[PDB]
């Protein structure tokens, strides 16, 4: 059915080649077309290297597909809804499992999707807000992050948290078109003090690097 | 300071954010050596090569003229530990300098030398990788250019023996397509 299908076309009129495989939304822009300024970027940018000439002939941008984000969101909503009884330590397990489920899989593509970052932030805030509801308070001074983010070895909940990161925001009018870059940041979540929290994404190795590493490791192994 | 850097870097997605987080804090500048020493150590010490920690070191250079200097220094500081570091982390480095040098944060190389005289089998591997990465980007032709205008000597000479060590060694690396002129010179 044409309705479910999708088509993209590369021709002298169309530089960009879009497609969707598995969960990944992929764009491909050659350097033989108008790439203008050649530049690097976060690992969300893959370099497509000619096997013959060992040259970087194009760039593939990754983006986390819509339906995927939808599935994750329904998974969080599953955690909130399906548990009214269950213990608070148990929910945090549910969160952690789902969250690494997203992050180990997507990795690089996550950082180039702003919609995800938003969704994660609001969802962390929803499960923590729910645990708050669990006792009776919403009062922030009664739930500093030390209680949620302590590894339960010391008696916290051991919550894996990706959502204290800053969320890049620039120029909606232009950002809907030309990919302007980052002129601003929005605060994802609160911190009692200046403080900090570590992000999962920083501790996971990107897919590109683990691929190259794989090839090298095997060859050296032989 | 050393601990704050780590926390700011482990926190941030992207490489852009860590610099913003770091600059924002407005930590004292002179330390702008050791900080960067921090980044080079912090990821390289970190288990496997990751694109992020290498980019960060570089941007931190373009923003202030000194940061660039701070890096080139830190590359020098390697000579002492060229032998000493264990044979994984060379796998992070070789590339990791590969990505500062492909993108122009080359002639700083020259300081590095090929001799059985003094090169650490460590250092041997270090440089080995460094080329097997940087090549894979420039693709061995643009590299032909960059070298041909480089005037890198301690690498590329006298010492017909050391021309056997050089050229041979780049048959071992395998690239050995930038070793031609030297082959002629042997003759």
């Amino acid at each position: 059915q044409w309705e479910n299908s999708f088509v993209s076309v590369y021709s002298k009129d169309n530089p960009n080649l879009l497609f969707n495989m598995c969960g990944f939304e992929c764009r491909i822009l050659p350097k033989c077309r108008t790439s203008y300024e050649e530049f690097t970027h976060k690992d969300g940018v893959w370099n497509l290297q000619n096997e013959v000439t060992k040259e970087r002939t194009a760039q593939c941008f990754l983006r986390v597909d819509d339906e995927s984000m939808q599935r994750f969101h329904n998974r969080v909503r599953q955690i909130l809804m399906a548990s009214g009884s269950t213990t608070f330590t148990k929910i945090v397990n549910k969160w952690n499992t789902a969250l690494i489920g997203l992050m180990t899989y997507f990795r690089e593509a996550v950082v180039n999707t702003q919609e995800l970052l938003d969704l994660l932030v609001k969802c962390e805030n929803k499960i923590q807000t729910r645990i708050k509801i669990g006792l009776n308070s919403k009062m922030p001074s009664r739930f500093p992050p030390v209680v949620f983010y302590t590894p339960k070895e010391l008696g916290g909940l051991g919550m894996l948290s990706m959502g204290h990161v800053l969320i890049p925001q620039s120029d909606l009018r232009w950002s809907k078109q030309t990919d302007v870059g980052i002129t601003h940041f929005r605060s994802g979540m609160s911190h009692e003090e200046d403080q900090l929290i570590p992000n999962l994404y920083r501790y996971i190795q990107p897919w590109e690097s683990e691929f190259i590493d794989s090839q090298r490791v095997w060859a050296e192994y032989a | 300071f050393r601990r704050t850097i780590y926390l700011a870097i482990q926190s941030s997605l992207d490489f852009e954010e860590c610099a913003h987080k770091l600059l924002k804090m407005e930590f004292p500048e002179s330390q702008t050596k050791e900080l960067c020493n921090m980044i080079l150590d912090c990821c390289a010490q970190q288990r496997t090569y990751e694109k992020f920690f290498g980019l960060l070191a570089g941007r931190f250079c373009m923003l202030k003229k000194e940061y660039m200097e701070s890096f080139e220094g830190i590359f020098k500081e390697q000579y002492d530990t060229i032998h000493r570091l264990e044979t994984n982390k060379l796998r992070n480095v070789a590339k990791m300098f590969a990505h500062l040098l492909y993108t122009d944060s080359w002639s700083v190389l020259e300081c590095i030398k090929l001799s059985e005289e003094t090169t650490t089998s460590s250092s041997r591997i270090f440089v080995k990788i460094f080329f097997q990465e940087l090549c894979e980007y420039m693709g061995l032709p643009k590299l032909n250019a960059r070298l041909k205008d480089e005037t890198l000597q301690p690498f590329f000479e006298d010492n017909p023996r050391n021309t056997r060590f050089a050229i041979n060694f780049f048959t071992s690396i395998g690239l050995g397509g930038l070793t031609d002129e030297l082959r002629e010179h042997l003759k």
Binding site: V121, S170, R173, H184, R186 | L63
Partner: peptide, 26 residues
């Protein structure tokens, strides 16, 4: 000046809506 940036209102957002400018831009 909300220059088309930030949320319409930090109501459902999970945040405090705080937008400071990118301190490292260029």
């Amino acid at each position: 000046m909300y220059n088309g940036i930030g949320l319409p209102t930090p109501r459902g957002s999970g945040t405090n809506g705080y937008v400071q400018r990118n301190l490292s831009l260029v």
